[PDB]
């Protein structure tokens, strides 16, 4: 991805040999910057609504004539708007993004009839998985605001058209926008972005209201629709070793009809439960989480004890074999993330919008057993453990039990 | 929505002769109602015609 | 649109019902009116003469025609009652319109007791008019010739329909061609079916439309003049006047109402800016 | 006729200096003789509403505009049944006769007409 | 323009097919087999699915645990699936972990233990799978759809097989199945992503050279199905969403109408209320359904097999009093493929498909799946230029002629699950397959 | 008795040639014949019946 | 007649040795000739249900009994329209002919009749 600048907008593109191009606008407008709760989700859903040059209807009908597709999502850090189309149709897609950023008519009827109902279905579909809920609850306990803001719009706190219009005035500005083109000729994209995004406001860098503060605690989301438990440990100094540790501890199987050879995978034997360790770097803080879902609260409780033990055991001693297995699983995870268009866009988006250079999968550091055990030791001896229980919460563990 | 259901006049006919939900096991003795309707239509047609010629 | 369209058919059935009932007396106007009105069917190309003989049940209006008119005159009011019920059921989906032309969904009253008691006033006003004709002047609306028994030999001085059919008769006389005249006469009723299309107004009804109100006034008075011209003799200058009134009748639907309703739309918009 | 049609034709007239010079005074007199203001209506309260497009435009009115329209319809209905006219502040003054509904119906119709056009596109 | 798919053979008749992408760092290698549940009879139905479980249960060298560790150490993962006509076993890895992954796949396919103790253990796991598919409504619907459309025929059988067979599957019949079916002339070794073709051919010569050849080598993708117009109703009033599939007999992979059927399917298209753009789609059915809230979703499909197919639509709806309208409007849109479609709809669908068929292939696994599927169904990978030409050859006359012989006034197979009281009887549904006005 | 994927036995009723044009055409021949006799019967009925309104024998005499 | 009445009279008969000796054998033949068991019905499936009391009793059936009753009604309807009788396990055996509904309807009616009595109480 050759990083450049076109009329004040950061543009990164990588040419390829495929008939299919992916163009993504990455906006510094994720939930950690959300002025009011849910606004970044609403702004994402307001993309490709009516603009002054082109109605939402006309856009969708023309997109079907190109056979293009449209993908949008919100993270804690970004809003990502992606289009996938044939290489030759690049100018149309550049101009479409320009119309969205410069000329979106934010109309109240679109909010009530189109945008908010779709936002609500989006969230309900995600929450069908209790593990999603548990990991969201864990971020809320751990960070409170900023990273602790909800990613998604919720019913209890309504977003108004004035909220969304204000946020869009901040976000849709040259300072918060990066263009990422997969299988796009980089010289051609710079020329097109330079003509199309020239009249976009310059604006200012959107910032997180307040510094990231870490907290421990418990969240007990009582649902009737499945059971899950996250054990998170907030990290004040994000370090790349936690990727290796997440992959080492593992949890999912690498093979059909198997349990797996990972410590967390072996913690589920004799139970219909699954487990997944994840590490979330957010630049200035991080979160190391272990999420366990299952149908039995008794089994979840059982696995949760084994999970905390596994982390303590790791803090004691890692073998050389295990450390190499962690390097291999981690390099692989990095590679597939840089391939997947959704995650790819945000990775280069971070490099362009902040200045955090991407770590290429081939350059993923090999951590010695000493370095891994040290990282696990810090987590087992955390002052601020978070536990989010979802489901039959009366039957799930508490932080002080773990 | 289908016109037969949407339009109030059509929907009245629909409710009696088309979508009308019937038991699946009516035997042939449930056919006398339609024969009575047939007799009534024959009597109206023949009766009005005889009225054109009768004094 | 649907209650109005079924309404137009109710009006046609009332005309047929009343025409057949008038023949039943079998006085001079009964016979000669049946003869001339039934001979209009002879204009239907190719089969017209055959259809007339078939309707009469013979070669002129006679006993077979009278007996069949009795049977049909008895039947037609029952058919008319069914169509009257159909147009009410069709109306029930929107409810009654009202004189302001706006929705009444904001402010409804039960039919009873309010409109029950308001209907009694006009029932008694109607019964007073009924009483004055039926008891004090029972033959004012009739033709003396219908007290002479039908005589196929002697033709009455003037053969005219009952007063309520007179405007349609004037329209028919206006066209010199037989078939032309019959088409025009039928079209004068069926053209009511196009009002939903030719009225281009964004507003329902005339309460707030001064130009439409003037046009409506002229249309109604022209309809009454056509009625009068239906019973004058075919003489100057009434021949030409009947043709001008016929043109005005049709031009209301085809030209004037579409033009006036278009212009009034623009005056409401510009006038209230 | 569509509101779109009425609005476009009116704009053609308002552009032409000659045309506006002769049409605008007539339209103002027409409105005065129409007399809907004497029942406390605004012009847009009279537009036929029993149509999918108009029902959608009315649903998009802001709540305040919607509640006030309901009151003007009820008040006009009460003047109509009483055979009275508005007096005083119930009479709509010319400056209060605002086109509150026109922008909503023009947006509803814009989409409706674009949908009709696009249903008839032919790939070239 | 995507890189050329290279293809080589071994002596036994194993095909190697590869498509390199020097921009990615991962690779998907695997074995596509032209064999599946359809190759079983009634007595051993379920064997192919049973084998897929045992393939990961230990080989002559590596035990179950060693297998787990070996893959964990590779860093990527292994995956498998068995369908009615196709079995796949693949490994996603790093660029330089490809020789490990080929070696593990070759081991689990050729040298699996199928130990009586493991047969007995899985026999319970698979028995539990019978009572948990019940939740995956789309799969329940499509399995009943095949069962009824191809009543008492091999395509009509499920992949899991009956409970009775699961209890009686022996290592003998497992071994017999994979010896008869997993032959070199029915197998394709596929690599996509960061793979060298010449490297992959060497690995094939090293690991897959001692594969049996079949006695009578037919070409890849070689097969008579007699469709039954019929219905299965699985009414469940406690479910909130109705799931309905309606299908007619469709087209095989090698039909001359294969592209015509895809274009017709694209004219109806898909719809999902949860996607923002779906209210603005061009499809007539999409407009009717969205305006009237008739459904949460619908998905048109055109499934192909070697000698038949099913073409139809899958609907989901909460609108339980208007299921009749939903079905009525859907079948009236099908009628219009016979009576009304013109160059307007046909050219629009062709535009959308020309991109769609390329867009689908957006990762190494999708590319590998495309090479593997095409090689095992057609015997070759069809270049995008050829695909563009075949799509361009579809005219409106072709669509109307196809719909008139395939859809118009034809028997349907119909499956309804959930609150389907409002779904009318077979005749009233089948009467919507024609229009009395035409 | 338990599995819903095992379709009940319909072999006593199923026709082997059920998807053929000849199969459909036969059933439409029955429907068509029925429609044809109903058309011919309606025509005869209407013609004979309505002829009552044409001049009776005593009138033609 | 009410189920309560039928049940009480039946209990009077079953008490009397003489009466039961002559009535019980008759009732058993009656049931055999009735032939509802040959359509796979249980006796209680035949009781008229279009009354408030019976609709309430049916709503109080345990879900399993309710689902099984639905199946027996559908199955009997299919025998009726086909002009066939049950065979094999579809025939209701005498030991399967259980009064699953009688306790529910007797409770519904007990309350209904107590309510009627208490509506007519007179403070003494
Ligand atoms: C007048 C205008 C003409 C139109 C004719 C309409 C008549 C049709 C009708 O209702 O009767 C047909 C009717 C056949 O109707 P179905 O629908 O087959 O059966 C109705 C009963 O359930 C049939 O009862 P079942 O299934 O118990 O079968 C009994 C029936 C056999 O029924 C037949 O199929 C004949 O035979 C008899 O009962 C004969 C009596 C023994 C005499 C010796 O025949 C009878 O039921 C006759 C029995 C009446 C005594
Ligand atoms: C003769 C000409 C009549 C023209 C009527 C002009 C309007 C008018 O002054 O009427 C008073 C009233 C005016 O009522 P309005 O409802 O318009 O106004 C009420 C008062 N304001 C405006 C303050 C709300 O009109 C009617 O009531 C008209 C009903 C017409 C009936 C016509 C019968 C003719 C039959 C021929 C059939 C063909
Ligand atoms: C009483 C007089 C009835 C005269 C019927 C005239 C012919 C119509 C007819 O037979 O209908 C067959 C037709 C067709 O029957 P069908 O609807 O079973 O056939 C449709 C499928 N195709 C076209 C492929 C054969 O029915 C109608 O059109 C309805 C009119 C019947 C009245
Ligand atoms: C007397 C003459 C009998 C009527 C014959 C009419 C045409 C018969 C053939 C036409 C036909 O079968 O087509 C059906 C028309 O039937 C119909 O639509 C009518 C079905 C039968 C009509 C009779 C109804 C009850 C008769 C008793 C009289 C009632 C008492 C009132 C006097 C279509 O229908 P499909 O759904 O099968 O089409 C399936 C796909 N298009
Ligand atoms: C339920 C409907 C009807 C029934 C049961 C019925 C019954 C009868 C009967 C029993 C007769 C004596 C027939 C004879 O022996 O000659 C008769 C005669 C007659 N009916 Fe009807 N009728 C009915 C409807 C009508 C209608 C609607 C008319 C319309 C006028 C009508 C007109 C006549 C006439 C004119 C005669 C005398 C001529 C004759 O005897 O045939 N009938 N009717
Ligand atoms: C037997 C003759 C008729 C009867 C008994 C009849 C009766 C009625 C009644 C009771 C109503 C509701 C109350 C009212 O608005 O006055 C009504 C409404 C109506 N009628 Fe008629 N009607 C007849 C003929 C006609 C004709 C000939 C037409 C049209 C040409 C017609 C068109 C309508 C319409 C459009 C309405 C709705 C008017 C509205 O409320 O805005 N009717 N009719
Ligand atoms: C028999 C000849 C055919 C002509 C029809 C007979 C005319 C009698 C019709 C007028 C009586 C009103 O008839 C009444 O109409 C409504 C809708 O039409 C029916 O209503 C029924 O169907 C509609 C949809 O089909 C549903 O909204 C409703 O839930 C259901 O109850 C009533 O069950 C019926 O009683
Ligand atoms: C909307 C429908 C269209 C209009 C309906 C037409 C109404 C009248 C049509 C013809 C009626 C008379 O037409 C005539 O019918 C009678 C049968 O009834 C036929 O007469 C034939 O059969 C009758 C008895 O069945 C014999 O007595 C006669 O000798 C023989 O010729 C004539 O051959 C035919 O010329």
Author numbering:
A (entry chain B): 15 to 416
B (entry chain C): 1 to 55
C (entry chain N): 111 to 383
D (entry chain R), G (entry chain G): 2 to 125
E (entry chain A): 26 to 248, 260 to 474
F (entry chain E): 39 to 99
Provide passages from the article that reported this PDB entry.
Consistent with previous EPR experiments, the Rieske domain was found in a position closer to cyt b when the high-potential chain was reduced by sodium ascorbate compared with when it was fully or partially oxidized. In the absence of quinols, the reduced Rieske domain interacted more closely with cytochrome b and cytochrome c 1 than in the oxidized state.
The cytochrome bc 1 complex, also known as respiratory complex III (CIII), in the electron-transfer chain of the inner mitochondrial membrane is a homodimer (CIII2) of two biochemically identical protomers. CIII2 catalyses the transfer of electrons from the lipophilic two-electron donor ubiquinol (QH2) to the water-soluble, one-electron acceptor protein cytochrome c, contributing to an electrochemical proton gradient across the membrane. The Rieske domain is tethered to the complex by one transmembrane helix and a connecting flexible linker that acts as a hinge.
